[PDB]
mmCIF file of C-alpha atoms and ligand atoms in Angstrom:
data_model
loop_
_atom_site.group_PDB
_atom_site.id
_atom_site.type_symbol
_atom_site.label_atom_id
_atom_site.label_comp_id
_atom_site.label_asym_id
_atom_site.label_seq_id
_atom_site.Cartn_x
_atom_site.Cartn_y
_atom_site.Cartn_z
ATOM 1 C CA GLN A 1 72.184 118.482 152.183
ATOM 2 C CA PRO A 2 73.914 119.291 155.494
ATOM 3 C CA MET A 3 77.706 119.665 155.379
ATOM 4 C CA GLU A 4 77.923 117.732 158.628
ATOM 5 C CA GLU A 5 75.663 115.884 161.040
ATOM 6 C CA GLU A 6 76.622 114.441 164.415
ATOM 7 C CA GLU A 7 74.660 112.911 167.261
ATOM 8 C CA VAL A 8 75.299 114.793 170.498
ATOM 9 C CA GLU A 9 74.628 113.230 173.900
ATOM 10 C CA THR A 10 74.103 115.222 177.091
ATOM 11 C CA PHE A 11 74.834 113.631 180.466
ATOM 12 C CA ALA A 12 74.174 114.964 183.946
ATOM 13 C CA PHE A 13 77.185 115.145 186.250
ATOM 14 C CA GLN A 14 77.008 112.877 189.287
ATOM 15 C CA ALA A 15 75.726 115.010 192.170
ATOM 16 C CA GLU A 16 78.965 115.396 194.133
ATOM 17 C CA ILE A 17 80.928 116.223 190.993
ATOM 18 C CA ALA A 18 78.400 118.935 190.152
ATOM 19 C CA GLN A 19 78.828 120.323 193.670
ATOM 20 C CA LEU A 20 82.599 120.320 193.355
ATOM 21 C CA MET A 21 82.485 122.116 190.009
ATOM 22 C CA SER A 22 80.221 124.812 191.430
ATOM 23 C CA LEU A 23 82.527 125.313 194.404
ATOM 24 C CA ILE A 24 85.561 125.561 192.133
ATOM 25 C CA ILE A 25 84.191 127.835 189.414
ATOM 26 C CA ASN A 26 82.497 130.233 191.842
ATOM 27 C CA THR A 27 84.839 130.499 194.813
ATOM 28 C CA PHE A 28 87.705 132.966 195.041
ATOM 29 C CA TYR A 29 91.121 131.367 195.375
ATOM 30 C CA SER A 30 94.422 133.248 195.372
ATOM 31 C CA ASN A 31 96.437 130.409 193.813
ATOM 32 C CA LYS A 32 94.430 129.532 190.693
ATOM 33 C CA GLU A 33 97.613 128.884 188.701
ATOM 34 C CA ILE A 34 97.748 125.349 190.104
ATOM 35 C CA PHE A 35 95.274 124.322 187.406
ATOM 36 C CA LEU A 36 98.141 123.956 184.944
ATOM 37 C CA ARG A 37 100.130 121.697 187.273
ATOM 38 C CA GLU A 38 97.087 119.449 187.697
ATOM 39 C CA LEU A 39 96.373 119.173 183.971
ATOM 40 C CA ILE A 40 100.026 118.479 183.206
ATOM 41 C CA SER A 41 100.008 115.860 185.980
ATOM 42 C CA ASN A 42 96.994 114.239 184.302
ATOM 43 C CA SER A 43 98.782 114.224 180.950
ATOM 44 C CA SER A 44 101.850 112.653 182.565
ATOM 45 C CA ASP A 45 99.719 109.889 184.088
ATOM 46 C CA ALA A 46 98.089 109.226 180.712
ATOM 47 C CA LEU A 47 101.545 109.087 179.129
ATOM 48 C CA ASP A 48 102.764 106.683 181.835
ATOM 49 C CA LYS A 49 99.879 104.389 180.911
ATOM 50 C CA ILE A 50 100.458 104.143 177.171
ATOM 51 C CA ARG A 51 104.178 103.774 177.883
ATOM 52 C CA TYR A 52 103.500 100.881 180.258
ATOM 53 C CA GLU A 53 101.404 99.171 177.588
ATOM 54 C CA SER A 54 104.119 99.620 174.957
ATOM 55 C CA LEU A 55 106.615 97.800 177.186
ATOM 56 C CA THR A 56 105.059 94.460 176.247
ATOM 57 C CA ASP A 57 103.263 95.538 173.075
ATOM 58 C CA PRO A 58 105.225 97.969 170.855
ATOM 59 C CA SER A 59 102.361 98.069 168.351
ATOM 60 C CA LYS A 60 100.618 100.176 170.991
ATOM 61 C CA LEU A 61 102.762 103.019 169.660
ATOM 62 C CA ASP A 62 101.715 102.575 166.027
ATOM 63 C CA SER A 63 99.537 105.623 166.697
ATOM 64 C CA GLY A 64 102.638 107.630 167.591
ATOM 65 C CA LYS A 65 105.891 106.978 169.428
ATOM 66 C CA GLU A 66 106.594 110.464 170.760
ATOM 67 C CA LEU A 67 105.470 110.859 174.360
ATOM 68 C CA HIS A 68 105.115 114.547 175.192
ATOM 69 C CA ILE A 69 102.983 117.471 176.345
ATOM 70 C CA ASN A 70 102.253 120.643 174.345
ATOM 71 C CA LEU A 71 100.904 123.901 175.774
ATOM 72 C CA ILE A 72 99.122 126.107 173.244
ATOM 73 C CA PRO A 73 97.907 129.630 174.112
ATOM 74 C CA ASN A 74 95.646 131.324 171.559
ATOM 75 C CA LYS A 75 94.948 134.958 172.465
ATOM 76 C CA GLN A 76 92.577 135.418 169.536
ATOM 77 C CA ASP A 77 90.328 132.570 170.731
ATOM 78 C CA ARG A 78 91.184 133.240 174.376
ATOM 79 C CA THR A 79 92.018 129.556 174.776
ATOM 80 C CA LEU A 80 94.834 127.682 176.449
ATOM 81 C CA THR A 81 95.123 124.105 175.234
ATOM 82 C CA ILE A 82 97.096 121.294 176.874
ATOM 83 C CA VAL A 83 97.832 118.433 174.454
ATOM 84 C CA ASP A 84 99.339 115.050 175.266
ATOM 85 C CA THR A 85 100.053 111.823 173.392
ATOM 86 C CA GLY A 86 98.972 109.656 176.309
ATOM 87 C CA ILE A 87 96.693 106.632 176.232
ATOM 88 C CA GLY A 88 93.593 108.725 175.629
ATOM 89 C CA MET A 89 90.008 107.821 176.465
ATOM 90 C CA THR A 90 87.342 105.627 174.912
ATOM 91 C CA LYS A 91 83.787 106.974 174.827
ATOM 92 C CA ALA A 92 82.930 104.926 177.908
ATOM 93 C CA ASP A 93 86.069 106.304 179.548
ATOM 94 C CA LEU A 94 84.911 109.861 178.858
ATOM 95 C CA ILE A 95 81.455 109.270 180.282
ATOM 96 C CA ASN A 96 82.511 107.121 183.241
ATOM 97 C CA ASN A 97 85.699 108.885 184.274
ATOM 98 C CA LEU A 98 84.880 112.496 183.409
ATOM 99 C CA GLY A 99 81.473 113.013 184.938
ATOM 100 C CA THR A 100 78.936 110.315 185.738
ATOM 101 C CA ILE A 101 80.770 108.179 188.279
ATOM 102 C CA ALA A 102 81.817 109.796 191.539
ATOM 103 C CA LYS A 103 85.009 108.483 193.099
ATOM 104 C CA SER A 104 85.366 108.568 196.885
ATOM 105 C CA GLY A 105 87.857 111.399 196.463
ATOM 106 C CA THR A 106 85.169 113.795 195.268
ATOM 107 C CA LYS A 107 83.253 114.135 198.538
ATOM 108 C CA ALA A 108 86.487 113.601 200.458
ATOM 109 C CA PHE A 109 88.093 116.631 198.822
ATOM 110 C CA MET A 110 85.166 118.956 199.528
ATOM 111 C CA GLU A 111 85.243 117.678 203.100
ATOM 112 C CA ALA A 112 88.960 118.432 203.265
ATOM 113 C CA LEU A 113 88.448 122.007 202.029
ATOM 114 C CA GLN A 114 85.797 122.663 204.662
ATOM 115 C CA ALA A 115 88.205 121.177 207.222
ATOM 116 C CA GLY A 116 90.765 123.804 206.261
ATOM 117 C CA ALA A 117 92.772 122.149 203.488
ATOM 118 C CA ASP A 118 93.891 124.026 200.374
ATOM 119 C CA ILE A 119 92.602 123.775 196.786
ATOM 120 C CA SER A 120 96.180 122.997 195.730
ATOM 121 C CA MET A 121 95.690 119.528 197.243
ATOM 122 C CA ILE A 122 92.965 118.640 194.749
ATOM 123 C CA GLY A 123 95.298 116.322 192.844
ATOM 124 C CA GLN A 124 95.745 114.032 195.831
ATOM 125 C CA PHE A 125 92.011 113.333 195.791
ATOM 126 C CA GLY A 126 92.113 112.243 192.163
ATOM 127 C CA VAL A 127 89.900 115.029 190.817
ATOM 128 C CA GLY A 128 92.440 117.573 189.654
ATOM 129 C CA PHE A 129 90.892 117.796 186.189
ATOM 130 C CA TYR A 130 88.109 119.966 187.584
ATOM 131 C CA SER A 131 90.605 122.607 188.745
ATOM 132 C CA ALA A 132 90.402 123.643 185.087
ATOM 133 C CA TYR A 133 87.330 125.654 186.086
ATOM 134 C CA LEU A 134 89.400 127.847 188.374
ATOM 135 C CA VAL A 135 90.311 129.658 185.150
ATOM 136 C CA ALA A 136 87.961 128.411 182.422
ATOM 137 C CA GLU A 137 84.274 129.176 181.861
ATOM 138 C CA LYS A 138 84.095 126.264 179.425
ATOM 139 C CA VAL A 139 86.265 123.204 178.921
ATOM 140 C CA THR A 140 86.432 121.116 175.754
ATOM 141 C CA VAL A 141 88.237 117.770 175.811
ATOM 142 C CA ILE A 142 89.226 116.085 172.549
ATOM 143 C CA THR A 143 90.501 112.540 172.967
ATOM 144 C CA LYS A 144 91.626 109.556 170.893
ATOM 145 C CA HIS A 145 92.294 106.067 172.240
ATOM 146 C CA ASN A 146 93.859 103.211 170.254
ATOM 147 C CA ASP A 147 91.352 101.220 168.184
ATOM 148 C CA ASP A 148 88.689 103.861 168.877
ATOM 149 C CA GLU A 149 87.175 106.967 167.284
ATOM 150 C CA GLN A 150 88.006 110.535 168.300
ATOM 151 C CA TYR A 151 85.508 112.114 170.726
ATOM 152 C CA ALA A 152 84.772 115.601 172.041
ATOM 153 C CA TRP A 153 83.618 116.139 175.638
ATOM 154 C CA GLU A 154 82.401 119.601 176.707
ATOM 155 C CA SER A 155 80.962 121.418 179.718
ATOM 156 C CA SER A 156 80.430 124.961 180.947
ATOM 157 C CA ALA A 157 79.552 123.378 184.297
ATOM 158 C CA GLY A 158 76.008 124.028 185.476
ATOM 159 C CA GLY A 159 75.268 120.352 185.870
ATOM 160 C CA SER A 160 75.842 118.588 182.547
ATOM 161 C CA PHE A 161 78.362 117.825 179.813
ATOM 162 C CA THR A 162 78.111 116.727 176.180
ATOM 163 C CA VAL A 163 79.793 113.971 174.198
ATOM 164 C CA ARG A 164 80.037 113.695 170.415
ATOM 165 C CA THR A 165 82.282 112.228 167.728
ATOM 166 C CA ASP A 166 84.978 114.663 166.628
ATOM 167 C CA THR A 167 86.117 114.777 163.001
ATOM 168 C CA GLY A 168 87.797 118.179 163.098
ATOM 169 C CA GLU A 169 91.524 117.471 163.041
ATOM 170 C CA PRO A 170 92.504 113.822 163.614
ATOM 171 C CA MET A 171 94.878 113.135 166.499
ATOM 172 C CA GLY A 172 97.132 110.093 166.411
ATOM 173 C CA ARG A 173 96.442 109.299 170.061
ATOM 174 C CA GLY A 174 96.023 111.134 173.341
ATOM 175 C CA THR A 175 94.047 113.981 174.832
ATOM 176 C CA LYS A 176 93.612 117.690 174.216
ATOM 177 C CA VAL A 177 92.128 119.882 176.949
ATOM 178 C CA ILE A 178 90.922 123.201 175.559
ATOM 179 C CA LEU A 179 90.381 125.848 178.228
ATOM 180 C CA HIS A 180 88.089 128.688 177.190
ATOM 181 C CA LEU A 181 89.382 131.172 179.735
ATOM 182 C CA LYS A 182 87.365 133.505 181.949
ATOM 183 C CA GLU A 183 87.764 137.156 180.957
ATOM 184 C CA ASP A 184 89.900 138.028 183.988
ATOM 185 C CA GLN A 185 92.138 134.969 183.646
ATOM 186 C CA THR A 186 93.821 135.821 180.337
ATOM 187 C CA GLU A 187 97.213 136.136 182.037
ATOM 188 C CA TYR A 188 97.639 132.400 181.480
ATOM 189 C CA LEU A 189 97.864 133.153 177.763
ATOM 190 C CA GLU A 190 101.107 135.079 178.281
ATOM 191 C CA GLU A 191 104.407 133.340 177.600
ATOM 192 C CA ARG A 192 106.172 134.576 180.734
ATOM 193 C CA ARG A 193 103.293 133.401 182.926
ATOM 194 C CA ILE A 194 103.118 129.922 181.382
ATOM 195 C CA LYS A 195 106.875 129.543 181.650
ATOM 196 C CA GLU A 196 107.155 130.551 185.314
ATOM 197 C CA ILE A 197 104.283 128.280 186.370
ATOM 198 C CA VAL A 198 105.771 125.286 184.552
ATOM 199 C CA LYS A 199 109.188 126.015 186.064
ATOM 200 C CA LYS A 200 107.665 126.380 189.515
ATOM 201 C CA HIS A 201 105.267 123.431 189.691
ATOM 202 C CA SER A 202 106.086 120.944 186.937
ATOM 203 C CA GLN A 203 109.822 120.664 187.523
ATOM 204 C CA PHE A 204 109.729 116.884 187.900
ATOM 205 C CA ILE A 205 107.499 115.823 185.006
ATOM 206 C CA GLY A 206 109.356 113.167 183.049
ATOM 207 C CA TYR A 207 108.195 114.112 179.556
ATOM 208 C CA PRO A 208 109.045 116.975 177.187
ATOM 209 C CA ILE A 209 106.790 120.000 177.636
ATOM 210 C CA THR A 210 106.686 122.346 174.651
ATOM 211 C CA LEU A 211 105.088 125.754 174.156
ATOM 212 C CA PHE A 212 103.430 126.590 170.848
ATOM 213 C CA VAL A 213 102.287 130.219 170.706
ATOM 214 C CA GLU A 214 99.335 130.242 168.293
ATOM 215 C CA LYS A 215 98.413 133.225 166.092
ATOM 216 C CA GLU A 216 96.059 133.094 163.102
ATOM 217 C CA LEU A 217 97.499 135.375 160.442
HETATM 218 C C1 LIG B 1 94.260 111.434 184.825
HETATM 219 C C2 LIG B 1 92.884 111.048 184.319
HETATM 220 C C3 LIG B 1 91.763 111.334 185.165
HETATM 221 C C4 LIG B 1 90.443 111.009 184.770
HETATM 222 C C5 LIG B 1 90.210 110.393 183.522
HETATM 223 C C6 LIG B 1 91.299 110.095 182.659
HETATM 224 C C7 LIG B 1 92.661 110.408 183.024
HETATM 225 C C8 LIG B 1 93.848 110.084 182.070
HETATM 226 C C9 LIG B 1 94.454 108.693 182.321
HETATM 227 C C10 LIG B 1 93.749 107.772 181.328
HETATM 228 C C11 LIG B 1 93.484 108.662 180.120
HETATM 229 N N1 LIG B 1 93.545 110.048 180.602
HETATM 230 C C12 LIG B 1 93.336 111.116 179.687
HETATM 231 O O1 LIG B 1 93.103 110.967 178.485
HETATM 232 C C13 LIG B 1 93.413 112.522 180.176
HETATM 233 C C14 LIG B 1 92.342 113.090 180.936
HETATM 234 C C15 LIG B 1 92.429 114.423 181.412
HETATM 235 C C16 LIG B 1 93.584 115.191 181.127
HETATM 236 O O2 LIG B 1 93.643 116.463 181.604
HETATM 237 C C17 LIG B 1 94.654 114.646 180.369
HETATM 238 C C18 LIG B 1 94.563 113.308 179.895
HETATM 239 O O3 LIG B 1 95.616 112.832 179.175
#
């Protein structure tokens, strides 16, 4: 009878990760724009990985040979999406690497901030993904790894995230980070803003970065 039915799992964030997310989403910072640099850096790393694999196994690219990053503002949905065709994440990858396992860099980073370091350094501690919450009230991550199903990860912070199978629109391979922006952060939906931040901070990314301005007609 139902059109669709999907099992949804809810996981608690590891304690230090939950602390970091609260610090990030609540604290005032003057340089929030660095979130885009961090997410693009993540995409680049994921692209480096699938590329490495394809060096010895070309069939790794059967799911798509183009290695690139797309930025997609949607003013109607108030979302900014960063899409890449990197190696993507398995379900275990999602759960392990985006929430439940703390890396040493998590506590280290919060220690660094209290010691006077800047939020812009977050990427050096290996947790730059969470800078997304500088500007987003909710983040949705859609991801597809070779040989695996497509999954959707989601969290509005507050201590937990969900995982479920995603059947919406099939990706060949890679990861899509959908930022549901805070009301006062909608500037990052504007073309001039996206362009100047990419020019300023992502100068040396070795993959094509393309803007797609989305409007439902
Ligand atoms: C960098 C990183 C940190 C933690 C977990 C996974 C990753 C990368 C490398 C392996 C797969 N992966 C992604 O799918 C991915 C994730 C977030 C993101 O914003 C863009 C992405 O492409």
